[PDB]
Amino acid sequence: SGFKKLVSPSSAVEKCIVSVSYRGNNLNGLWLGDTIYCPRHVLGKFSGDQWNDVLNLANNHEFEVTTQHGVTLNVVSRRLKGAVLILQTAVANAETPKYKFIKANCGDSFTIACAYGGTVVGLYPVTMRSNGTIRASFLAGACGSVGFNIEKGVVNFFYMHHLELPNALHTGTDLMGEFYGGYVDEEVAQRVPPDNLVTNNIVAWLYAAIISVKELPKWLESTTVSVDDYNKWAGDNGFTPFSTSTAITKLSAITGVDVCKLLRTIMVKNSQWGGDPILGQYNFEDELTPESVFNQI
Amino acid sequence: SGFKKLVSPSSAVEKCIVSVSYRGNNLNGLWLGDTIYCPRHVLGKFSGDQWNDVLNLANNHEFEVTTQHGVTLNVVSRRLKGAVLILQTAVANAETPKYKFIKANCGDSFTIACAYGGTVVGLYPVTMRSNGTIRASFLAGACGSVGFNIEKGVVNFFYMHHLELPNALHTGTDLMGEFYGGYVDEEVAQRVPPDNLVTNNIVAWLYAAIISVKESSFSLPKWLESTTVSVDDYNKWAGDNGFTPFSTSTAITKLSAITGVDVCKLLRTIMVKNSQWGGDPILGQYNFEDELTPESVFNQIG
Numbered sequence: 215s216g217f218k219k220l221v222s223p224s225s226a227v228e229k230c231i232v233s234v235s236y237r238g239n240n241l242n243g244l245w246l247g248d249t250i251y252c253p254r255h256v257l258g259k260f261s262g263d264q265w266n267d268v269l270n271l272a273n274n275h276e277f278e279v280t281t282q283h284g285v286t287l288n289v290v291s292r293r294l295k296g297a298v299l300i301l302q303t304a305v306a307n308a309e310t311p312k313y314k315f316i317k318a319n320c321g322d323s324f325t326i327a328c329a330y331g332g333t334v335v336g337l338y339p340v341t342m343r344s345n346g347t348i349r350a351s352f353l354a355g356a357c358g359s360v361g362f363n364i365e366k367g368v369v370n371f372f373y374m375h376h377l378e379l380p381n382a383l384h385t386g387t388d389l390m391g392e393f394y395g396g397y398v399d400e401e402v403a404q405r406v407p408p409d410n411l412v413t414n415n416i417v418a419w420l421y422a423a424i425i426s427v428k429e430l431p432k433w434l435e436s437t438t439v440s441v442d443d444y445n446k447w448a449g450d451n452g453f454t455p456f457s458t459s460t461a462i463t464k465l466s467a468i469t470g471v472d473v474c475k476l477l478r479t480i481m482v483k484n485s486q487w488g489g490d491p492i493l494g495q496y497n498f499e500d501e502l503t504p505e506s507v508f509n510q511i
Numbered sequence: 512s513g514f515k516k517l518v519s520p521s522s523a524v525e526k527c528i529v530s531v532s533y534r535g536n537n538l539n540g541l542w543l544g545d546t547i548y549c550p551r552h553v554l555g556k557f558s559g560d561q562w563n564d565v566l567n568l569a570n571n572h573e574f575e576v577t578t579q580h581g582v583t584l585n586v587v588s589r590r591l592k593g594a595v596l597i598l599q600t601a602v603a604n605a606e607t608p609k610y611k612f613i614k615a616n617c618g619d620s621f622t623i624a625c626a627y628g629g630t631v632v633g634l635y636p637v638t639m640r641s642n643g644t645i646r647a648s649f650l651a652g653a654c655g656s657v658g659f660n661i662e663k664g665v666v667n668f669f670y671m672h673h674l675e676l677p678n679a680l681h682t683g684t685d686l687m688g689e690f691y692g693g694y695v696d697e698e699v700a701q702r703v704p705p706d707n708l709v710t711n712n713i714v715a716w717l718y719a720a721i722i723s724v725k726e727s728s729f730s731l732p733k734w735l736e737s738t739t740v741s742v743d744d745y746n747k748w749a750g751d752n753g754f755t756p757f758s759t760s761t762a763i764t765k766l767s768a769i770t771g772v773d774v775c776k777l778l779r780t781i782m783v784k785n786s787q788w789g790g791d792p793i794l795g796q797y798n799f800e801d802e803l804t805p806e807s808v809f810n811q812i813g
């Protein structure tokens with residue numbers, strides 16, 4: 215029993231995180247096979263089409279790349295893919311795990327391996343927000359830190375960290391160099407669309423509260439609302455649409471509470487929470503997924 | 512910018528977690544040197560003076576120990592130390608890190624390496640509560656999972672998991688085999704004292720919020736009280752309102768000096784908000800977060 219936001223174990227990712235420095239710019243890279251992925255702004259703060267000419271003018275021998283073992287790697291080639299710089303090394307990483315490059319959807323949760331100087335210093339979970347940001351914890355030098363999980367012995371890579379927007383919001387690319395949310399790696403003003411609370415994860419958290427209380431809650435409404443009616447309301451109140459899933463179906467069956475009862479709870483509690491807490495909180499938790507809640511049963 | 516509850520990287524610990532089986536009891540062990548630490552109730556569900564005779568009654572060849580690699584270890588000796596069973600292996604773990612066995616105090620936070628069948632499946636942070644429990648996430652087979660952090664290239668081990676009390680409360684021993692909170696590894700009703708909100712961690716969280724408002728609105732937070740309260744006076748109030756006592760620390764001193772805000776203004780804020788929070792949130796919440804430590808907040812400034 216008990217519900218936590220789980221982090222994936224890090225040993226397989228630690229074996230792939232290297233330091234990448236160029237003319238005093240210090241960040242991190244992901245070494246898979248004979249390929250290092252890192253943010254292109256390790257070269258400097260350029261914009262638009264200046265990048266392709268900065269690339270051809272760069273010097274491979276000036277990429278300072280060290281491993282956690284202290285071994286210096288030698289860059290033999292370079293190219294850009296989106297906002298990710300791709301550096302080929304002379305020798306392959308023999309500790310490359312099985313992996314996939316996957317784009318994270320809204321509400322998807324994964325683990326950040328927060329790195330400085332090529333060394334993972336700590337981990338934490340995050341959720342891909344509706345506006346292409348994550349709520350993370352990053353300082354200077356963290357770029358190149360990666361977001362991942364592990365599923366059936368495969369490392370899924372979702373994210374590489376590039377920049378911090380106002381109000382402690384963070385964003386970056388997938389491992390194919392496409393920026394989440396359409397942001398750009400320029401220190402300029404960028405519009406951030408409003409964050410919509412992730413209904414499906416809130417539903418997971420409400421079910422976790424019900425399972426916890428099994429030992430029905432007073433905050434749980436008794437009336438119902440259809441999925442269409444909730445989704446109409448959601449688009450007007452800052453929530454994502456409710457979408458059916460296998461995990462949510464299992465949670466409803468295990469607890470014996472129809473999910474449309476939880477949707478009505480969301481509408482009423484968002485309008486006026488009142489004095490009754492849900493798992494000690496007077497605000498919705500939306501970074502715990504239905505799959506994780508079910509795995510903890 | 513941004514504040515998260517951090518987990519320590521797990522590679523050093525993953526290389527030390529093994530599966531330990533005895534007569535259908537399948538748990539986890541911590542393999543350091545030629546020594547495996549695991550919960551004694553891998554031997555079955557006994558009580559009191561029964562354990563020593565059960566230890567003499569067990570035989571080493573019936574312990575099935577396997578590493579994450581699939582390698583079978585051979586137990587050459589056994590002893591009890593408190594509620595921890597200590598098994599000697601024929602060969603030593605060549606991947607043993609530098610480590611310390613340390614007893615976590617109330618409010619100390621660390622990483623749980625949650626393991627099943629000798630394999631770490633996930634991590635998460637926990638805080639040692641005032642009653643000797645942690646609020647974790649554990650299923651059958653999770654015992655022998657360890658709580659740890661890494662400091663200065665040294666793995667501190669604080670905790671090994673033994674049991675789950677009512678209301679999703681988890682507890683266990685330090686690596687010296689002493690149970691936190693005076694619990695025992697028996698399936699009977701047990702006395703569980705109140706869980707008090709950890710003041711020192713709330714203070715840290717409030718500093719984190721001051722820092723965030725400073726770096727988002729260049730001003731002091733709207734909810735921060737103007738008056739101060741004495742530490743002795745706050746600690747008198749804390750004893751009658753379900754909070755731990757405040758106690759100064761180097762990390763809290765640094766946070767006070769970086770932000771320029773007297774910590775006694777934060778203690779008065781706790782008293783005011785606990786009696787009547789109101790409508791202004793703190794870092795998006797209307798309830799105290801007490802599992803983010805001063806040390807962690809300091810490390811997340813730089």
Ligand SMILES: *C(=N)[C@H](C[C@@H]1CCNC1=O)NC(=O)[C@H](CC(C)C)NC(=O)[C@@H](NS(C)(=O)=O)C(C)(C)C
Pocket residue numbers: 241255258259260352353354355356357358375376377378379380384398399400401402512
């Ligand atoms: C990568 N090492 C670094 C990580 C930032 C630094 C503080 N917290 C983080 O997450 N990324 C940067 O410094 C980028 C680099 C540019 C070229 C994209 N710059 C920023 O993140 C910038 N924010 S912005 C895009 O101007 O709004 C800062 C440095 C002012 C935060």
Ligand SMILES: *C(=N)[C@H](C[C@@H]1CCNC1=O)NC(=O)[C@H](CC(C)C)NC(=O)[C@@H](NS(C)(=O)=O)C(C)(C)C
Pocket residue numbers: 215538552555556649650651652653654655672673674675676677681695696697698699
């Ligand atoms: C160890 N693998 C297991 C971990 C528990 C199981 C479910 N969640 C956990 O944290 N520990 C046990 O099964 C112990 C064993 C005894 C001999 C110490 N038993 C319990 O935790 C028991 N709770 S109790 C001590 O009666 O209050 C359960 C199994 C009923 C939860």
